[PDB]
Design a protein around this nucleic acid. Structure first.
Length: 245
RNA sequence: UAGGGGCGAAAGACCAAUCGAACAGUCUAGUUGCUGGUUCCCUCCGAAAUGUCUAUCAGGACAGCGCGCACGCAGAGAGAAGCAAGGUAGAGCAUGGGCCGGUAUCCUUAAGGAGACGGACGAACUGCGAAUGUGCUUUUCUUCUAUGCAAGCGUAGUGGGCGAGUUCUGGUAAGCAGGACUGGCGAAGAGGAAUGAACCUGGCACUGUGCUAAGGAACCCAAUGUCUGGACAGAGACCGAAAGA
RNA sequence: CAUCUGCUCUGAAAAUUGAUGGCGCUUACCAGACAUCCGAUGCACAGUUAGCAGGUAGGAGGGCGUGUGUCUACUGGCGAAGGUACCGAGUGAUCGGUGGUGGAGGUAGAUGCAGAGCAGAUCUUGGUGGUAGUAGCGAUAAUUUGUCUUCAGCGGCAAAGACUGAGGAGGAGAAGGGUUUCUUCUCAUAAGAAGAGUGAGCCGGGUCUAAGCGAGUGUGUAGAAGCAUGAGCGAAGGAGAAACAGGUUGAUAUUCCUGUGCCUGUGCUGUCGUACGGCAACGUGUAUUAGCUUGUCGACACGAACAUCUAGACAAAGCAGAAACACCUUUUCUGUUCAAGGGGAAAAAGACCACUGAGACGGAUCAUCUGGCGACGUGGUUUUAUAUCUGUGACCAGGCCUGAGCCUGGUUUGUUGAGGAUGGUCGUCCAUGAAAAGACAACUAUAUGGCAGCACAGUCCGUACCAACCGUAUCAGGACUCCAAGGUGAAGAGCCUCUAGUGGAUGUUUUACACAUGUAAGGGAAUUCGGCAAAAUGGAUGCGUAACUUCGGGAGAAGUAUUGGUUCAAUUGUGAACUCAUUGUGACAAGGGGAAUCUGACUGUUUAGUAAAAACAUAGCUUCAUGAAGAGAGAUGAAGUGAGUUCUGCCCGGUGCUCGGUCGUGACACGGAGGAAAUGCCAGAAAGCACGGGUUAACGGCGGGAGUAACUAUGACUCUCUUAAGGUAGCCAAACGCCUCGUCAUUUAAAUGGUGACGCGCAUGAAUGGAAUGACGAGAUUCCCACUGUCCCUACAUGUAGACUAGCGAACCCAUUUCCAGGGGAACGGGCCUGGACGGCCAGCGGGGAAAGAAGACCCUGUUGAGCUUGACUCUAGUGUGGCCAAGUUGUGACGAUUGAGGCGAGCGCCAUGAUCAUCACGACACACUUGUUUAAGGACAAAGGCCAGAUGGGGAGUUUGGCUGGGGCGGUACGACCACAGAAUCAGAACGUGGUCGACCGAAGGUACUCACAGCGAGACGAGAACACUCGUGUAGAGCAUAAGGACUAAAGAGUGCCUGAGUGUGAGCACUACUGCUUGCAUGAGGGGAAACCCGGGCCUAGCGAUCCUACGCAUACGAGACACUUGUGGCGUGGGUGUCAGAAAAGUUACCACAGGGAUAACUGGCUUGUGGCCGCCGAGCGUAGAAAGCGACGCGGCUUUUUGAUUCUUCGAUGUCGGCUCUUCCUAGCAUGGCCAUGCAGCCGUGGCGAAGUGUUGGAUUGUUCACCCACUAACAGGGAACGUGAGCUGGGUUUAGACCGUCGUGAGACAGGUUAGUUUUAUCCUACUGUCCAAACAGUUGAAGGGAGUGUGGAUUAGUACGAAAGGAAACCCACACGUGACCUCUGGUGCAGCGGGUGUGCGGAAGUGCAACUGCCAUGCUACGU
RNA sequence: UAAGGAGCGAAGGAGGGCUAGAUUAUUGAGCAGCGAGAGGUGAAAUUUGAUGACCUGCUUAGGAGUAACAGAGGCGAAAG
């Protein structure tokens, strides 16, 4: 047969375009700074708003981008790095923040610029500090617990734009605007409605799959469709998670 | 974004009147056990549609039947006369299978059974047995025979057949399917059955005079009349049963 | 009288008209005989001749002709070759001469070399016919008259008549074209030839940057591709310094000329400058370069309402000129202009500054709103149009003259108003709506800078025209944009007009059949698969509006009434009166409505060119995988179901996916033992596999049999088999039910239909999603109201073609000689044989030419393909897993490998610890390697490369998927062997002919020598019986012989008993159609067997139990071995084993309804032919039955025929094509007689019937369900018989069924896919030829006639009278003449319907100044003549 | 007014809403010790344990609750 939809959309001419982008998002590199928030802006592909910051490096003014936490305003002064106060919207070394606190834009290793929590409405929880090894345990929004060194930086607050998934998209055109900038195929034609030249689920005198939909992790790429390496299937209840800090 | 690739609100849709794999050009005069065609005259000879093996059944090869060149040469698609083998037609029912009825007598019953016998029968019953056909010897056995036979060597076509008379098997039968024997049409014209591949007479270089065949002889149409019996039905010359006055 | 033989007779019925061959024959027949004649390519005689003589496929011998070579002989201007008429020679292929034409070359003989002879190939190229002066040439607005040319153009010009109608058939640009544009001449004409024509600082290109492309360099590659970075490039419609009026040419113009300007720079001469004002909001002053830095401009979505301006359009008055006047009118028409640049208001809308000090309150918008972070008020500051003036006069209208110049006007007011411009507000979004070049301000330094005059400069390329573009063209198609008047009306709708633009194949009143349209008595879907098509409804205003519902909707529900003109009131609500001959959204424009069911939620999308859908999409719902990112779990990808409401039961046995451990297996490397060494051997061994768990909103799956309740039925209850679990809740003859047209109710006169119920449901059912509704479908289906030419049943009229005529002018197709009936024939003839008939012409028509299209698409065959699937065969990319490979450095412990000095148990193995090399975790440093944490972080790990080895692998690649066969498939095996039967008494001998057997078994069931029988039957012998052991007599096999069938065997070949391993070893010859195989037989040998010996034995009493080349295993002796020699491996020879059952021997699964190619009537799906089982119809006999009684009527059990209208059986004709079911329409034939006419019998009183005979003239209907033929009901009737003609009839129609490609359901399949199972959507081409048929002319002067031959026509019902009669116990109950009607036939318009071309009238919208006369769009009342039936 | 409503003074109650804290207990994980059974009942089986249960230490993570004092005691319109 021919090449399936899933492979074609991974070729280079289909990658997302950057022409409307504001810049690369991430923290400054300097040990200490005082910054001012210049503007709060929407960026074409992203639902969380961005804040433009201004800080001096040598004598010269320089500009950066952060993801906005909820409760900043244009004109606010913010303090970055060691010796910053625990005030909403400051950036601090993680070892300085008390247990049970909520944080965003956490660095996985020092000076990486911030990864981890970046989507609207999300946060992470500080669950443990180890005074020997200088590690800290953070609980991520998937439920995963990960350990990071005390020298990493983090932003104090919750990411702006929460609640967005409460309102249903009642019409086809509303879905169109949401997926127009994403990589997923919309509208999505079902594999059982294709001919066998186009998809492993195609063909036959009734619309059916005909073979089990759970497939191996090591299966060849042009036929790896369906539920890939599923441990279980169906709507029944699972089992207890195992937890360590 | 480009061909075993694209693109698809999915129809195998669309990608320059081309898409269940584009166009141009080359390899390439790709291959073909299958269809079509294959160019002058006269003379002489003249088939086969069967057997064995084949991923064989619309094809091959080997053998059998033609022709050419021919070393050589007592032979013959016919009879007699001695001699073998055969189990069909007819005939029979003696081992085996198998239908109906029995006198005297016998056994029991007071029923039935057996029976000295008669009638009816078999592709896989036989005690007897033809005609026709087959083989052996003898030219020291009639009759024919050189314009004849012919080892050997080289090489062709053929390997869908069909029909008549006599017979057979399967089938209600069939211008049906399948065998055997002797001549045909295939590859055969001419005269006759009004017409007809195969039926009757009878086998063809080219002319002329006579005669016959088969079939005809009022007229169409070359040749026709006679004698004796039957027969009356718009009958017969061409044409159907059991049953009948 | 009874039998038998001959001829006649009865049994004896088929579809166009018919066949002893015809006409005829009764003395042309049947049977028995007789005469002699006619008749072959045969026979006789005679010529010619080698004479011996037919011939396909095929084979051989001798000759004729063509282009060129070598030689010999000749020839041509006193006319060569060629070509054309005649004449001679040869059996023939061919050859020779004569007369005209032609104008320079040509042969005869013998040999040599070949591109060496045509009727055909749907042959190749070129040229020409018939058809044929024919088919056609005419969609759109429309044309007439005069006059000149033209020389014969509806060409030009005047006057009329029309049309596009400002979302134009008008005026311009772009893409595309490229001289098509202008002048002259000529026809050569959508034709040529010769010239001429496009002028810029201010218009556009050359500039900037979007999405993006990229030279070079780095890395890579055999070279490439690719990847990282990046000079340069990327918009004639995005950003982008500065121009406008009026004139002029045959053709250019914001480009030329005149006038008035502007931008960017340069230079001269004058003339001034180095600062101030306001509480402030800010002003006055035309101001230099340069630089940091901060900001602004360039610089931006959609939608709605409200202001203001400008084009435009109206109406009054003034003047100037036009139109109209039988009448009337100060009625009607055209004009009334002002650019860029300069100067400049009031106004409206917002910002802001000073004073002031406000509320349970003031201000303010069409709408939101607004104020102590300062309201109202009073005075100011600033930003954004426009009117008006100047632009020095141009331009327009009119008058007077004129081959030129003068003169006069261009004045005032009101209403409205964009489809253009601008301003400040408001709404929407999980969508927030480009960059850069180039500018400007503030701040800091620095200063000869501003203005006026005059002068200079600004390169290069494009510039004509389009109705001329792409479709083979002068093609009804396609193709990016701009400007836009008046009336009617909501409206750049339709209809009518102004500005501007427009047109030719000719004449004829022109039948039939058409194509676009009108109208119709009475009836109203009766029509048809189906209301398909048409009709009906229609705008605005008011009254009045149901079920159900997600509460939004349904809803314009439905149902009803009103509407013109005039003259008034009243001011947006509307009222009232008067008036008209059909009435008023008058033309144009403009919904039919209701009740239910199946199905998809909705708007949206799709097979360009047969499918618009129930299919796809969609919002919502659920599952899966991941902490990797230029992205970071409210994320990023993969699947399934299909909005909302309400539910979503049970199963982890199989298959898959996933998790955990090894107990076993499982590669290469790395080790070990041995040997002179190679080859082998042993260990070792990840992941996988196996094993144990999880998982169905994963693939999917979800039962049988018996009994049992006070009538019968049914079974809550019991028992029994069975499993992974035995279909829960719901729903149903449903788009899913075979039987099936299921049963009951309702709808109709009548229901294979619809709806409601019921349910052991062939084969319903739960995100392979189940069930109940709303709103919305060009979706499928049933019914009702309105409405109608769909129909009964057709008639009349209009336009355009068509017929005839002038001008112009083709194609398909074609072996052609073409009237029928029967016969035969390749089984349906135009041509052949025997009969019936025989002409040409013009216009129509569709019976035939199995008419033309196109090497049948269905079906089979080919050792021909391609797309797609998987549990087919053999490989492969990707993904995982192991060991090894760039000398990192140094610590600690550990297991392991190798050998000593210790200890235990009757020097052994076992237990202690001490030295020698690898080596697995763990630490701590920095040097390889990694990362924009980069003057940095990690770190010998990772990540990325390389060489070998295992695992997985329809993601892909190649290929295969036997044969015979009463077509193929499914089934069997007639595919290798053996016996019997038949195949007309040797042997042989076919069919999916008949009855069967084989793929082995046995140390004896083999070899030998000797002994004796057997199966039964008749007597005996205790228990002991039907049947126990023992005896005597008979006993030709009635028994046995392992295993089919046949043959064979008696002191044995059978049953016993003894001994043996001949079921030896070498090597020959033969038989069965004879290779393999099986058997028969010769000679030589054994320290061979059995027997006294003669004799016998190298398997089974005989006929069946089996297999090549190459490779490999074993036995046997004799060989070979590379320069030489020794050994371990190897190679030769003979013979046996390991195996091919498709058995004279390849290594192999499906599907195509998406399909291709070569062929086949060697072979299926129609018709025809042969047959007639089965279907239908008729005879013979007489057992019984009929109230008696064979036979009025019947007729068992048996027997003989006919028919082709049923279905089989067979495969002769057609696969380079004979259009396939039913209906509609129309004609003819048959009889086996339903009605109607004449008769005979009766169990015939009469009435009504029943059985038969001669007879085919005239009849045999309207409907409901269904695609039906068929069936079954209702209504009528004299009666509602049965059939044929290529299952009559598609260049006659229709297209409901079946049978291409889309899609749903059930059952089957792992799947692609299947299903004489159900459902819905699905392109019907061409006559102009010949012949037939229908009419028309000629053959046939004119007037009057004749009648050969051909055609043919009237059929039936009722009433009255006989008559309440005959006849019958009664009840009942018949038989001419006359009159009324229906159907059919032929005519006719006096009457009555219908139609409206000629004729008279009326109104609506808009044109010609009014009235009168009238155009266009079309509407409407009456109606001559004519034609017609619903009339006579 | 030994009818009602407004108000003053000192005091009492598990009456109600909110904010910030608490002693144990029951489960779950981590690590350490030990080396065979634990659980449950009238009596037992499903079941769990050498991948170390049970029991004893130390760490942690959550979400409920307020024992004994506590009564013919108190409060509220009742539910509480």
């Amino acid at each position: 047969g021919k090449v399936i939809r899933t492979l074609r959309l991974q070729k280079e001419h289909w990658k997302r375009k950057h022409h409307k982008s504001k810049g690369i998002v991430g923290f400054p590199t300097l040990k200490n700074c005082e910054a001012t928030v210049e503007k709060i802006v929407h960026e074409s592909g992203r639902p969380a708003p961005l804040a433009i910051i201004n800080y001096k490096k040598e004598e010269k003014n320089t500009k950066g981008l952060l993801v906005a936490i909820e409760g900043i305003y244009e004109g606010q002064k913010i303090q970055i790095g060691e010796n910053a106060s625990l005030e909403l919207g400051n950036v601090c070394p993680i070892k300085e923040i008390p247990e049970g606190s909520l944080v965003s834009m956490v660095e996985k290793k020092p000076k990486d610029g911030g990864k981890y929590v970046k989507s609207p409405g999300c946060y992470a929880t500080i669950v443990y500090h180890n005074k020997l090894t200088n590690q800290t345990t953070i609980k991520l929004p998937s439920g995963e617990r990960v350990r990071v060194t005390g020298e990493s930086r983090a932003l104090l607050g919750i990411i702006a734009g929460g609640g967005k998934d409460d309102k249903p998209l009642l019409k086809a055109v509303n879905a169109y605007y949401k997926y127009k900038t994403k990589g997923k195929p919309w509208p999505r034609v079902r594999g059982v409605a294709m001919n066998p030249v186009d998809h492993p689920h195609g063909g036959g005198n009734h619309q059916h799959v005909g073979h089990p939909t759970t497939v191996s992790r090591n299966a060849p790429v042009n036929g790896r469709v369906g539920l890939v390496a599923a441990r279980r299937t169906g709507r029944k209840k699972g089992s207890r998670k195992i937890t360590v800090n």
